């Protein structure tokens, strides 16, 4: 009874929240890990194919974003009150190690610095520069809104992600637009339902 209308009637939308950190993946280079949706007790760690949409998996980790850092990759997460720590593999959410005494190490996730390296924006327009011999290949007109450049990969699978409006993300590749995502719907508080629907006697006999 299900297989006819398995996916036809079900209506599921995936919301990842406003992205806080985008970490590249050492293997399968067109893949990233997104830390998003902070709160007082947990955050949402997801994996994301960057040349498409197609969220791969999501997990609600019970650590704040500032407690989640790389190794010295392996994504060490360390509580601060106690020293309960968990090392989780990238590219598969395997609990590589668990412990209570000491964390192995951490490195602070670096800031972008995408200016002075690869980007210059002057005439309401975005130019991608080589580091040296700045011939300014792959220029693109800016969108209407523009906040920042979330992610940028310069090697062969070129991918670029722009945080265009406050909650919208646009993804380009070598530049043509490839995908577009919106997380305006991250938390629904209340609802209301709107319905849509259609729209002497002898003279009656004759008509």
């Amino acid at each position, epitope marked *: 009874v299900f297989s006819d209308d398995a996916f036809i009637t079900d209506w599921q939308l995936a919301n990842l929240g406003p992205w806080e950190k985008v970490i590249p993946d050492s293997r399968d280079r067109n893949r990233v890990l997104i830390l998003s949706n902070p709160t007082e007790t947990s955050c949402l760690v997801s994996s994301f194919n960057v040349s498409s949409g197609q969220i791969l998996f999501r997990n609600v980790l019970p650590f704040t974003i500032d407690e989640i850092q790389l190794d010295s990759n392996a994504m060490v997460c360390v509580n601060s009150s106690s020293n309960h720590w968990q090392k989780y593999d990238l590219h598969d959410w395997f609990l590589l190690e668990e412990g209570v005494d000491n964390a192995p190490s951490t490195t602070i996730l670096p800031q972008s610095s995408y200016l002075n390296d690869q980007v210059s924006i*002057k005439n309401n327009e975005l130019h991608i520069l080589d580091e040296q011999s700045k011939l300014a290949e792959w220029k693109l007109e800016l969108p209407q809104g523009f906040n920042k450049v979330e992610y940028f990969h310069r090697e062969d699978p070129l991918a670029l992600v722009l945080n265009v409006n*406050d909650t919208q993300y646009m993804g380009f590749s070598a530049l043509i637009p490839v995908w577009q995502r919106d997380e305006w719907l991250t938390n629904v508080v209340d609802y209301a339902v709107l319905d849509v629907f259609d729209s002497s006697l002898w003279n009656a006999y004759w008509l």
Partner: antibody
């Protein structure tokens, strides 16, 4: 204009004590911008940079709470504004302050 | 350190005609890539300031098409193609290379 900043603080201060102000953010992406304080003293001027980062990288001419999204300042009479700036460079910030705060008034009187 | 000078301290202009404000700096604001790091601000009376032009030549979101910017190095210029009585308030420069200053205070005064 959904990401807008709300302020708390104090109105009356005698000379020589510290001035506590607190912004609070109501939008996305607390990490990716430099959040700065600016003064306007009456007398037709503005000058400050009190920059901050999500990983605390204070750049004076500004305490941070990543738990609740509220930077905090503790230091003359003026109006004090929050800000939010582009973060192109690594540890410096790049100005371009959009989404200012509503602004609090601080009078240092006897 | 860096000092910003705005040429006209008061510029009354009738609505309809172009207007321009100039801005000069001691040091150079020319980044290696080609980013200029100069912003132009407008403060309406009794209001928080607004952003008009945000990386020396761009235009901020939610701003009319009337405003434009130009310049490089040590000189910069804001230009309004058509002035309207909404465009009243104080106009400020800012440099973002090192420790922004807010040197300025132009005072467009359209009641001549």
């Amino acid at each position: 204009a959904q990401v807008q900043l709300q302020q708390w603080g104090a109105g009356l201060l005698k000379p020589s004590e510290t001035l506590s102000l607190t912004c609070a953010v109501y939008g996305g992406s607390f990490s990716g911008y430099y959040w700065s304080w600016i003064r306007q003293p009456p007398g037709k001027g503005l000058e400050w940079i009190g920059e901050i980062n999500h990983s605390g990288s204070t750049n004076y001419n500004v305490d941070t709470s990543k738990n609740q999204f509220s930077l905090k300042l503790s230091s003359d009479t003026a109006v004090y504004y929050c800000a939010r700036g582009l973060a192109g460079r690594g540890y410096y910030g790049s100005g371009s302050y959009l989404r200012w705060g509503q602004g609090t008034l601080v009078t240092v009187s006897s | 350190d860096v000092v910003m000078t705005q040429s006209p301290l008061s510029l009354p202009v009738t609505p309809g005609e172009p207007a321009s404000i100039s801005c000069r700096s001691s040091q150079t604001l020319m980044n290696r890539n080609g980013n200029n790091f100069l912003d132009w601000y407008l403060q309406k009376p009794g209001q928080s300031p607004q952003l008009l032009i945000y990386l020396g030549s761009n235009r901020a979101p939610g701003v009319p098409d009337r405003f434009s910017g130009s310049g490089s190095g040590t000189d910069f210029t804001l230009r309004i193609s058509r002035v309207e009585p909404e465009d009243v308030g104080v106009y400020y420069c800012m440099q973002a290379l090192q420790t922004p200053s807010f040197g300025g205070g132009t005072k467009v005064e359209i009641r001549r």
